[PDB]
Design a protein around this ligand. Structure first.
Ligand SMILES: Nc1ncnc2c1ncn2[C@@H]1O[C@H](COP(=O)(O)OP(=O)(O)O)[C@@H](O)[C@H]1O
Ligand SMILES: [Mg+2]
Lengths: 60, 124, 462, 577
């Protein structure tokens, strides 16, 4: 009885941690994708004047 | 998960800097047919002289052989025309065994790490 | 942007460059072959007539007609930033992890400076390293540089990876200062098999303990001068982080024997006389240069702990490499063939292995107040367990006293419950707990190194 | 191309002047006889050509013509069932041309030309082949020998000649350019064939020796260094590895080792049978031979040619072993032509860059996934001959830091004929950890347990040898004289193997599992029966362990039923004491 209840709680908590890992997993995929968008959006609004800065350093 | 988040952040950081470097490269490679480049070439030409005193020869793009003729005879040096050296000049000094090179592409490849730290500061 | 063409005399790893005098001594050069390939060289012996360049890589395609050199970074430096803590580097400083390169805050010279001997304090706290027979019997204090004298075929790289992903400070064991220090592992492997390089990439990125570390790796087939420059790189990155951003930092220098072989085979390139037993005479100074750049600092809130792991050459302690290492460092810990292949991991053995600074790193509010006495007691008990286990072959089990058979059972079970750790993240309280469970098999009263306060408090419980 | 004249001759070193502008490592043609040579150390006008044949009768003024190419092998179909020398010249062709001596100055091709191979095409026209995509197949003695795109060649295939009988010159696949792709292609010996991605060692190299497969294993992408004094069974061991192991092809690189132990290899491999399929064993060995009186600069070329032919057969999805005996003869060739550069040498006399060379050679091993997508693996077994018979040299203690699987021989085990003379006390293998999955899913489930028990019994024996030679094998306790006698019977049964017996030459690992299970069943129940209290004379005269002492001579067919009955008698002869 004791070893049966042991492996029953073992399998149930396997599957519980599997759901935990998959939930935080998909959360952090969406998190990294949203942050990649959140930075490459910020890329565009300061492009040409920074290029003028580097062009003024390179051609001094 | 936090380490993958940091990987995505540094990846985005690097590709925005790749965008910046690429558009600087395109502005550089679009310079020599816009109405400034015979004012561009003289500065780096005389500075290729002054970075190696005692030159004998210069060689650069033959599209502005006039601006390398009548503004470098006072520089007192051979001028020989060989293309394939885009945006600049190179100076062969004395005894034929030294060659200072000078190009805006070369200056970008020498200055881009320092300007990358500076652009990342003034950009983020 | 300034080629010095006109070179003469290539010879093995040395090419000479004519008519060059702006080449700073110890500069780095791009050697460009005439077919568009770039190599590295270090400038040595720059004179009026010429300047010698020791080429980094092989010399195959070079010639005299079309071969140019040019200067980059005239004294050796690296670009350091705070955001290099998820990265690998190739000895020079270029990544091999595929991520786009860092935005360098500072630009530091990879040759360091000696600390000012008034400007440091003594090391006084401790660190846990997961290994029980390090945490209890020869403690790693923050500032110590203790080397792991491996063998040849013993696991040293596995203990490297284990200490790398299991070291943690314990400020809760202190009088509860802040957690404002994070921890940082600077891991510098020089001269590795590349099988071990696959082992280090997977054993760092596996558990997600790469995110507080930085791996300066280079293979064996990579050129020898990167195996020179690698511990300079790692100690100057760690010195930057620990004295500019207040991190307790642990620096793991893998395989110092590969370093000293590369130092011999780069000393013999530029034609200086090898001194004792083939090694250069300045090996003591050059090796102390990369040991004595660790340690705490007065006033600042950092500490640089340093573990040089080194193979013994022909497993003796009279060779120049472990002789000078034990003649510079702070004690040693030592693996053993005997434990390893009667089957034990990690195979540290606590008889010949000591730490100098343990008496300053344990005690009142450091880790636990009974620590040093249990250290001495475990040492003497395993000491007279080994030789009584060796004597019992020629007298017999049933022809001793009784406490001596208790010592024999203690030693035989000691070296498979205390040293046979396996891989569990063994804390300091758990390891002292199992140390008292092992001391319980000795009779009370026979523990003649501990006063009865800690005896009555802790002893008895298996 | 580039003309020069000889300024100086000394031995195999010819300083040739006037060669303003040749590169390093370009093969020269020295003298009017067309001697092969190699450029090092050029300073202005001169260049320093070492030569691959003995200069005698060469005189100054004679011309030197460079080529511009570095030392290039010609790779293709036609190297299996082959003997070459250090610059890939076929010795059957040299015997057909000359008599029984090797006259210098000969030009022969690295692959024969008139032999009509049998092209089967693979790719349809119009495809965009990358460097390393396959092109077609050729049956080459039971191996479906592929024909690669050479590395660093990209394009679109226009034409493909059909499934016919062709020759190795004839261009079968022309790209869109006119860049055509014939069967053979040259490749420089100093660049590893650039591979896609290098996998990890997780699969054994089944040797056939028992100790070299049970106590000290070699994985698939592994390296293995076998050093030993003279007269210690190196070359019989390496012929056993070439003869019985599970590799697809075997590259035997004779480098400084004597003539007769490649003569007999040419004489007795054509009668043998491959253990993998039914082909004759000489149809899977490439055999590069540089004997000692063949000239003393070619040794470097012979080892680099053997390892790059092995890398070519790695790219074709095969699985290669490379047995390079006497790497220290290549160290001596580097010392000898580093004695005419008059440079300052390192420790012992050797040049400084010797560890750089040994690293750059032992790091072409490793199981890889190649350019074609299919995976392959070169394993390398390198022998080391120390000068004094002392593993404290700059050869051995530069090569023991970059290898796993170090098999240190000794002379004392080979003075009496206890072969192979593996000194167990100082050998190791770093592939015991990361191979136990394969051992579990292919030999037996309890194989690590049994193996580690064998290891700790041998360690406990070699810990008690101290006491037993300081006091004597009498006046002991009887519970450890069983340890010493089980160590004695494991050294007389499990480790000791004669290669020339018809059986026990080869020993697959279920037989070794059977013998170890017999020995440890005996030791477990014997220490049980001695804690019951018996003699130890009464153990060492049982009729149950002459069975054990003969239990390596049964074949791999009788060994199951023989194993069941020996196991039965060991389980049944201890209750009767
Ligand atoms: N596996 C073996 N079984 C029995 N005898 C062996 C074995 N290996 C070597 N020997 C004996 O030792 C000799 C060693 O030959 P060889 O390997 O050429 O010497 P070296 O070890 O110096 O190369 C052989 O001729 C043979 O008589
Ligand atoms: Mg031999």
């Amino acid at each position: 009885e004791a070893e049966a209840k042991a492996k029953a709680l073992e399998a149930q908590y396997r599957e519980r941690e599997r759901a935990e890992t998959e939930a935080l997993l998909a959360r952090y995929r969406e998190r990294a994708e949203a942050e990649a968008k959140a930075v490459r959006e910020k890329a565009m609004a300061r492009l040409d004047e920074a290029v003028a800065l580097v062009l003024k350093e390179v051609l001094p | 998960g936090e380490l993958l988040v940091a990987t995505a952040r540094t990846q985005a950081r690097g590709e925005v800097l790749e965008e910046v470097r690429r558009r600087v490269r395109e502005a550089l490679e679009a310079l020599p047919q816009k109405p400034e480049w015979p004012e561009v070439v003289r500065k780096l030409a005389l500075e290729a002289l002054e970075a190696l005193p005692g030159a004998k020869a210069l060689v650069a793009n033959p599209e502005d052989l006039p601006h390398l003729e009548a503004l470098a005879r006072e520089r007192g040096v051979e001028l020989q025309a060989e293309p394939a050296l885009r945006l600049g000049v190179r100076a062969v000094g004395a005894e034929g065994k030294t060659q200072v090179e000078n190009s805006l592409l070369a200056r970008l490849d020498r200055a881009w790490d320092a300007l990358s730290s500076k652009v990342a500061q003034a950009l983020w | 942007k300034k080629e010095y063409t006109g070179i003469t005399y290539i010879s093995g790893p040395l090419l000479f460059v004519e008519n060059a005098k702006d080449l700073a001594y110890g500069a780095i050069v791009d050697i460009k072959d005439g077919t568009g390939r770039v190599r590295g060289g270090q400038v040595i012996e720059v004179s009026e007539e010429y300047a010698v360049i020791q080429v980094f890589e092989e010399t195959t395609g070079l010639d005299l007609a079309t071969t140019s050199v040019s200067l980059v970074e005239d004294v050796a430096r690296l670009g350091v930033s705070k955001e290099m803590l998820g990265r690998r580097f190739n000895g020079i400083g270029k990544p091999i992890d595929g991520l786009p390169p860092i935005t360098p805050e500072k630009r530091l010279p990879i040759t360091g400076l000696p600390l000012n001997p008034v400007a440091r304090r003594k090391p006084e706290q401790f660190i846990q390293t997961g290994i029980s027979t390090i945490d209890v019997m020869n403690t790693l204090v923050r500032g110590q540089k203790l080397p792991i004298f491996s063998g040849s075929g013993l696991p040293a790289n596995e203990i490297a990876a284990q200490i790398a992903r299991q070291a943690t400070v314990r400020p809760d064991l202190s009088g509860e200062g802040e957690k404002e220090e994070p921890f940082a592992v600077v891991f510098a492997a020089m001269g590795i098999t590349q099988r071990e390089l696959s082992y280090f990439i997977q054993e760092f990125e596996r558990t997600g303990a790469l995110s507080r570390s930085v791996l300066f790796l280079n293979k064996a087939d990579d050129p020898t001068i990167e195996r020179i420059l690698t511990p300079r790189m790692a100690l100057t990155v760690a010195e930057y982080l620990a004295f500019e951003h207040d991190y307790h930092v642990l620096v793991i220098l893998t395989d110092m024997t590969n370093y000293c072989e590369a130092l011999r085979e780069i000393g013999a390139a530029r034609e200086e006389i090898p001194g004792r037993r083939g090694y250069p005479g300045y090996m003591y100074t050059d090796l102390a240069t990369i040991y004595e750049r660790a340690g705490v600092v007065e006033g600042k809130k950092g500490s640089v702990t340093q573990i040089p792991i080194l193979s013994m050459p022909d497993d003796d302690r009279t060779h120049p490499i472990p002789d000078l290492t034990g003649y510079i460092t702070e004690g040693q810990i030592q693996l053993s063939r005997e434990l390893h292949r009667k089957g034990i991991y990690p195979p540290i053995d606590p008889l010949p292995s000591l730490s100098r600074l343990m008496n300053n790193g344990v005690g009142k509010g450091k880790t636990r107040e009974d620590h040093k006495q249990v250290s001495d007691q475990l040492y003497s008990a395993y000491a007279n367990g080994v030789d009584i286990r060796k004597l019992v072959a020629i007298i017999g089990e049933d022809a001793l006293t009784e406490n001596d058979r208790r010592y024999l059972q203690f030693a035989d079970a000691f070296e498979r419950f205390f040293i046979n750790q396996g891989q569990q993240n063994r804390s300091i309280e758990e390891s002292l707990q199992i140390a008292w469970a092992l001391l319980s098999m000795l009779p009370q009263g026979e523990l003649k190194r501990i006063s009865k306060d800690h005896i009555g408090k802790y002893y008895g419980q298996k | 191309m580039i003309q020069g004249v000889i300024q100086k001759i000394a031995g195999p070193a010819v300083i040739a002047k006037g060669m303003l502008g040749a590169r390093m490592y370009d093969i020269c043609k020295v003298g009017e006889e067309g001697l092969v040579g190699e450029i090092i150390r050029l300073d202005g006008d001169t260049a320093f050509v070492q030569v691959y044949e003995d200069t005698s009768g060469l005189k100054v003024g004679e011309p030197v013509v460079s080529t511009g190419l570095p030392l290039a092998v010609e790779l293709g179909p036609g190297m299996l069932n082959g003997i070459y020398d250090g610059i890939q010249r076929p010795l059957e062709r040299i015997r057909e041309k000359t008599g029984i001596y090797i006259t210098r100055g000969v030009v022969v091709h690295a692959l024969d030309r008139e032999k009509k191979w049998a092209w089967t095409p693979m790719v349809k026209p119009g495809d965009e082949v990358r460097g390393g995509m396959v092109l077609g197949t050729v049956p080459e003695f039971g191996f479906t020998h592929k024909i690669l795109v050479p590395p660093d060649v990209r394009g679109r295939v226009k034409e493909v000649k059909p499934a016919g009988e062709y020759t190795v010159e004839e261009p079968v696949v022309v790209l869109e350019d006119g860049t055509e792709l014939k069967m053979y292609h040259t490749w420089p010996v100093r660049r590893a064939r650039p591979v896609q991605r290098k996998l990890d060692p997780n699969t054994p190299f089944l040797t056939g020796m028992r100790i070299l497969d049970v106590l000290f294993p070699v994985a698939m992408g592994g390296t293995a260094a076998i050093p030993g004094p003279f007269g210690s069974g190196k070359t019989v061991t390496q012929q056993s590895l070439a003869k019985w192991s599970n590799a697809d092809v075997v590259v035997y690189v004779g480098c400084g080792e004597r003539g007769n132990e490649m003569t007999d290899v040419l004489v007795e491999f054509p009668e043998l049978t491959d253990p993998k399929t039914g082909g004759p064993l000489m149809h899977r060995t490439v055999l590069i031979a540089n004997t000692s009186n063949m000239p003393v600069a070619a040794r470097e070329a012979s080892i680099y040619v053997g390892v790059t032919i092995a890398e070519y057969f790695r790219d074709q999805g095969f699985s290669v072993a490379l047995m390079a005996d006497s790497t220290s003869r290549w160290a001596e060739a580097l010392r000898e032509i580093s004695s005419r550069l008059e440079e300052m040498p390192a420790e012992e006399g050797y040049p400084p860059y010797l560890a750089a060379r040994l690293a750059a050679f032992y790091e072409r091993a490793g199981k890889v996934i190649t350019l074609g997508g299919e995976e392959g693996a070169v394993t390398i077994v390198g022998a080391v001959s120390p000068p004094g018979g002392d593993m404290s040299e700059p050869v051995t203690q530069s090569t023991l830091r970059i290898v796993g699987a170090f098999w240190r021989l000794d002379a004392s085990l080979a003075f009496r004929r206890h072969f192979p003379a593996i000194n167990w006390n100082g050998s190791y293998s770093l592939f015991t950890s990361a191979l136990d999955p394969w051992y579990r899913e292919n030999v037996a489930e309890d194989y690590p347990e049994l193996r580690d028990a064998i290891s700790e019994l041998l360690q406990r024996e070699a810990g008690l040898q101290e006491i037993v030679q300081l006091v004597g094998p009498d006046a002991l306790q009887d519970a450890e004289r069983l340890v010493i006698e089980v160590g004695r019977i494991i050294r007389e049964d499990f480790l000791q193997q004669n290669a020339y017996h018809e059986v026990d030459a080869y020993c697959s690992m279920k037989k070794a599992y059977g013998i170890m299970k017999m020995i440890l069943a005996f030791y477990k129940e014997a220490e049980a029966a001695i804690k019951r209290g018996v003699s130890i004379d009464e153990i060492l005269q049982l009729p149950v362990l002459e069975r054990i002492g003969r239990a390596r001579y049964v074949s791999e067919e009788e060994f199951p039923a023989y194993f069941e009955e020996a196991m039965k008698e060991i389980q049944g002869a201890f209750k009767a004491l």
